[PDB]
Design a protein around this ligand. Sequence first.
Ligand SMILES: CCCCCCCCCCCCCCCCC[C@@H](O)O[C@H](CO[C@H](O)CCCCCCCCCCCCCCC)COP(=O)(O)OCC[N+](C)(C)C
Lengths: 169, 275, 128, 119, 171, 59, 115, 85, 62, 78, 459
Amino acid sequence: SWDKDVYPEPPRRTPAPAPQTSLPNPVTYLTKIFDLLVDRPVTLAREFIEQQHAKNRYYYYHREFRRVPDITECEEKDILCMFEAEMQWRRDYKVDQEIVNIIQERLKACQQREGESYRQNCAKELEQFTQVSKAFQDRYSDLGAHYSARKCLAKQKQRMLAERKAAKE
Amino acid sequence: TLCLGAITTLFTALCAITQNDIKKIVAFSTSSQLGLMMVTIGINQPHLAFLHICMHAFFKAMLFMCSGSIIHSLNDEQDIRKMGGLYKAMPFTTTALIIGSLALTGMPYLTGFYSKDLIIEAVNMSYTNAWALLMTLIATSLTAAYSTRIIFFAFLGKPRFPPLVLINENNPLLINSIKRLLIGSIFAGFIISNNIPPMTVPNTTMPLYMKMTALIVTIMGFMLALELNNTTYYLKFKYPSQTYKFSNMLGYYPSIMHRLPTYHNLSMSQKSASS
Amino acid sequence: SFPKYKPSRLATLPATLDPAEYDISPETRKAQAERLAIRSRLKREYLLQYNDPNRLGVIEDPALIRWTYARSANIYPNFRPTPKTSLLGALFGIGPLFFWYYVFKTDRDKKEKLIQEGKLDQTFNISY
Amino acid sequence: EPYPDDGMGYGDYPKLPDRSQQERDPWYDWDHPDLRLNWGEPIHWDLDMYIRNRVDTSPTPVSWNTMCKHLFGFVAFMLFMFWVGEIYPSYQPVGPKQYPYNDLYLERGGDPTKEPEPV
Amino acid sequence: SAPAAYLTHQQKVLRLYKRALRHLESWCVHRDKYRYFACLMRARFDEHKNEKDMVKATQLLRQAEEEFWYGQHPQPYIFPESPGGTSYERYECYKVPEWCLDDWHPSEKAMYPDYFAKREQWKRLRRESWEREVKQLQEETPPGGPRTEALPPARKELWWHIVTRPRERPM
Amino acid sequence: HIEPRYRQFPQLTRSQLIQAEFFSATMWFWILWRFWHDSDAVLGHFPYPDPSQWTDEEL
Amino acid sequence: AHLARRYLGDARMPTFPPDYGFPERKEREMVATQQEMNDAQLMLQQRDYCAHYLIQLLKCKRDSFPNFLACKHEQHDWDYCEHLDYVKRMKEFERERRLLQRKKRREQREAEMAR
Amino acid sequence: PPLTLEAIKDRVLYVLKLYDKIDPEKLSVNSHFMKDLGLDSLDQVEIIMAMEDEFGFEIPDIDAEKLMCPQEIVDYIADKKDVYE
Amino acid sequence: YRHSIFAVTHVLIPVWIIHYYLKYHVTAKPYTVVERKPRIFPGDTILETGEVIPLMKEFPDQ
Amino acid sequence: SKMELPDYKQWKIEGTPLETVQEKLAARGLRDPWGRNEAWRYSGGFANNVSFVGALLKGFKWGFAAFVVAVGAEYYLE
Amino acid sequence: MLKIIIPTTMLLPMTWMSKHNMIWINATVHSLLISLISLSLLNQLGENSLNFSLTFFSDSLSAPLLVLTTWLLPLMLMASQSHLSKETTTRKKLYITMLILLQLFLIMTFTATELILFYILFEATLVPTLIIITRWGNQTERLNAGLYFLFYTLAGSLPLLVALVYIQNTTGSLNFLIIHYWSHPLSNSWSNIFMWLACIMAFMVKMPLYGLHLWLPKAHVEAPIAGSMVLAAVLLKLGGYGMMRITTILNPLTNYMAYPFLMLSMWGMIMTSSICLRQTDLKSLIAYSSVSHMALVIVAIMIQTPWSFMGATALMIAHGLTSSMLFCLANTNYERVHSRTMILARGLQTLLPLMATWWLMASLTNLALPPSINLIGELFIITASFSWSNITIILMGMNMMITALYSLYMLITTQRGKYTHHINNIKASFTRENALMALHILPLLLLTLNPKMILGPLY
Ligand SMILES: CCCCCCCCCCCCCCCCC[C@@H](O)O[C@H](CO[C@H](O)CCCCCCCCCCCCCCC)COP(=O)(O)OCC[N+](C)(C)C
């Protein structure tokens, strides 16, 4: 559960709190203890697999890609600059999408986690989602199909012109 | 949602008053129930709206299965007008159909009550359009109406199904089936209304006729429908009025909304497009 | 009784009410005798076809083939230009699509003026 | 019965009276009982629209225009009565009946926090 | 099963009678009231013109058709076998034509030696028979009138059509 | 196990009628026991005109 | 009907509160506790001032495995309090009714004194 | 009810017996219907519809026209029910 | 025995399997399963005692 | 294993409500041949229609009593 | 890849040298094998388009199509190999060569890379399919049909050709990768507009557009089934592939020129589907269903939103398989009774069951219900369309109405109901039949488990 313990975890707002409160009638939930025996089998079973799984553990590890200079500075005709920088930009794009995936998942988590209240901590996540989705909306909107770094550039200069037209007045 | 669910309760129930199939009647009934619970959503009380379904299933499955017993028993003759008067011929099915009809009717501590009364009462005490509430009233009357129609013709009369009688209620699995659904049909209203957390937050004050209305409308239903039905028993041939032909032509709706647009399209798809 | 039935294209009058069903003259009775004659002719034929051992395979009736033929291949060769058909064809043809052209184009322009000159743009709509 | 000469381009084909196949006698022993149309008997142009399972132009005890008038009028009355109903909600109503209909008010409540606990 | 014939007045008024009488039950529901009005009805047909000249009579029909059509009731009772039917063709899923079995191949055909034996007996009977129905049909027929079928005279009589229909409720 | 008759309807087994009657009686027993267990058709009284002193009017 | 008061309007209602010295302050009972309500969750519809009886009820109901048995006393506490509130919010409408009414009378009579 | 030919002839006569216009002693399976017995068609329609009604079976009209001899009737139901008994 | 083996398959195998699949997907990843989190009344939590009743100024009954 | 047909003779019409009808036709003088058939099997045998409300109270006669046993248990608990 | 393409050539010697009564087995077995080899291509990459030789590449957009195209050959063989039998050995051996030669042109024309190479193959496909339609189609009309199939392609393709040459003169290379990178907007004027139509009309002919689709039904009425399966399942889809390719250029002009074609398409879909609701004979009914679905692809391309291309890919493939399936599944009836007209088949279910099951599955996925890749393919493009114009849904919805009806219709009219009496001809379903359609439908259902490999490049 290192992945559960990974990035979402510091965002994860786990707490939980059982109550425990006996009264005059016998408790039905005791049946779960019988049902617990049904779990126990699988528990033991896991060891019978997990043990063997421990015996040999050739394994992978993460890959990472070095930074490269961007399109903005390669000249109007080099294809190789446009290309390296294109692949970099593309990787960066896919990454950013994955991040928005994460923040949405944490949003779903908060939503279900509330009993009925919310409009609470969920407002907190809702805010960061508002900022994130805002900027991500900005960076990558009407690019259309055949989205390309040269275009995201072409958009970024437009917003910057909006800023310069704004400061004048 | 309310605006339409009400009028579908009414418009369906009217056709339900006057049919001859067992199953068509039960069908119009089920749709009318659906319109009712639909205003139950439209009245902004979703929880009860869900609550009504859980009760509704038992009732309707009861009706169709006992009806299945009748129909299979007789070599399958859906039409009530030559359905026999067999109150004694199949006593167990009789019992079943009776508790069923009472449940759908909304008798005060039987299972259908815990839905229907809470519903229509909540509609009463709610701010809303009233004309729709009126429609809920006529509808809940007509529930009692057709529900008495099927009882009357199914059982009470001297029998008039064609002679030979292959009738045989017996076959134990069927018995066990109807048994279990009766069991739920009587206990479930109380048990479930009790066990569920009070999401409803009850409205229980003014006035007294508030709660009475659900009963009196039913009583008007049985009195009018039954005295009328007995008046049908006194010779004197009459010919139908227009209202009869209307409500018994299912509102004319299928016979116009099917013979018309389909014609203009299938014509158009050849008079023009294909050609 | 008084009200009297009124026949329509979707509700043809029942045969029992048709006046032609009643008034009847010996030559018209020759018409029915004729109709039974040809009907009996063809059905006698179909029975001679239907059940002798040696046929095995299907035997299509010519009329159905005339019909399927006339639902396709024969439509064009006839045609004839006629102004009623031609105008009706222009109408069903170019008409409705021009209609949709304006109906979409205006909405497009409206979203344009709101997204740009206005600021009523949707939020969160990052999916695209 | 040619259609007759006309620009629709279907020519020299019998024009037959419209008649959905229900109209033709069920008790007769047709060569093709589902189609219900023996053998060489020439087929109605729009056979398929009348093939049954499609349009059924069977005669109806109440006349057509009366059908249309009763139902369309019915839905009309249903709507107008409905919306005039909408004008006069329960616990508000037309003022005249409202003299009886008035009640409740009632609805206001909640801790002031709930005004922003929802916010 | 008795085809055609251009129609005649008597049978016409009769079918109007059975018809009207049936719708009349559909109204009267109870066996009682229905009996009463039925007797009243036949009483109407006789009390009226049980005998008359034709030209008046047809007019009497034109009256009767209207008077019926107004009262015909939105839906009559219908027996399930009948074209209305709650089960007009519930079993047409099942009535497989016989020639189809004649296809099972020997591993299946072996399992009912008896039935197949009897069946080839039949098929033999037909293939042997057919030319006779040919000559006879050729014989009794004029150029070819309204009438369908023709009597047996010494053997067989177009029988394979009807005689081997797949009964009524095969399953 | 049952025979056709032609009017008699040899209503087989008393047990059937025992069952039917049992459930009808079971029904009334429930509705009545519940009727005594509580009267849910009523609860608390309500009223309208009350008193002007509670509200306001002056003159 | 000028005398009749619209249901939608909150009421002269504001004036009426000021009009009745005794009524002020409303000081509406607040034993519910907003922080506590979230812990028990409830529903936004079930805010109310009788929420504390409701918490007593959910407590009692979770406390018994008997289910349908027992815990009607708490249900009657929540019931009865709910009734008292409905009565209050009932009398308020009679209040706005009669006060609008007096407003009409003293306005008519002021219209007389001013003729 | 798998049904048999005797059951058909028996139930049929058993209905013809109850009709008033027939005198029960004169009734016979082969007994003719017009040339014997004066019942006429207007009553013939009654006996046929009332008789089919006993079975719930339906009689097509053109076949109703023949009818006449009760044996022809039992033959007819024998065909439609395919009893082969 | 027929009821034995039949029940053995159809109710015993699926739950063993699917629960093992439960340790897979739930232990593997975050937010695979999101509880409503229990209502917590005035009574003390089992997590760490705490909690307290409020006021109880209510009076009269029935 | 054929069941026997009952009897031609045995279906009297006299006890039937239909007899009243035949009387009413006798007022018209009209003859109603079928009644001995129609009335026989149906109205004239087992037939004796149960009352509606009485049908509704099919279980009440026992239920009220078991209910008495129940309230008897109520006082017994006291 | 150059590895998959050689053996595809190699079957030809194998075909010619095969023993005279064994050839079907040869071609079948090896075509299956080469399918499995084709499958390894599917891997692609999540970023860069896969590359090979200087003259080929394998975009994710092409790979599922390539796998499909390789997959169809055995199927056409299984369908054909009883349709023909009495034909002379040399002629049959000549015949399968048409098919395989054809797919060879497809494997070449999907991997492209130069758009002139892509074009010349794009148009090279025209010959074998012509020969097949004309020599082995039944009934007279096929002759005429040949012509409609032909000129409508060329009259479209030829201007495209000149246009292509033009660009490689106004810019550097015609190659796809660099033109994807060196792409620069063309805008209004009037010359540029004619450039636009010149680079679109051929692709919009080859996948039929509503104003131009007339040849397609009249091809399908005629062609022997092996011609039908390709002419439906593939060539349309390739026209779509190319049009998705060339849209790397154009823009922003597409924003301004899409409208007329969006009207012919948005209206033509409802229209053709409506005509589809009343055909005389089945073999045409299927064809119009096909156009009625391709209109969705073509608007999906023109609104150019990434969702729309995802849905474009998915729907192209799904409609491929389902349409081919309906065709073979209809030819079976046509062989059993030679009726062609749908009315004669009648109660076919009564006499044999399992085919009714295939009718059910096939039609069922024709109407597209969840979670068929057909459906999910369609829902995206409705989404993006709806983003493009909120009104547009009212059109799409009507489609989803009529495509229900006629689809179920072809089921209930040619199946459920009474058997025709005298039609003794039917003879209880061969193994190859069931084998064949099971081969269509199984991949189609497994494929739903793993969409992520079919959605294509804009995934
Ligand atoms: C993609 C969908 C396609 C939709 C349909 C395509 C086009 C359909 C419309 C056809 C255009 C007009 C041609 C129609 C026939 C006109 C020529 C002639 O045959 O018509 C005469 C009759 O037709 C009328 O005169 C012509 C009416 C034409 C008006 C319709 C034009 C609608 C505009 C369509 C758009 C145009 C394209 C613009 C670009 C968008 C009959 O000839 P004739 O019998 O010997 O002499 C007349 C007999 N008189 C004296 C007794 C009257």
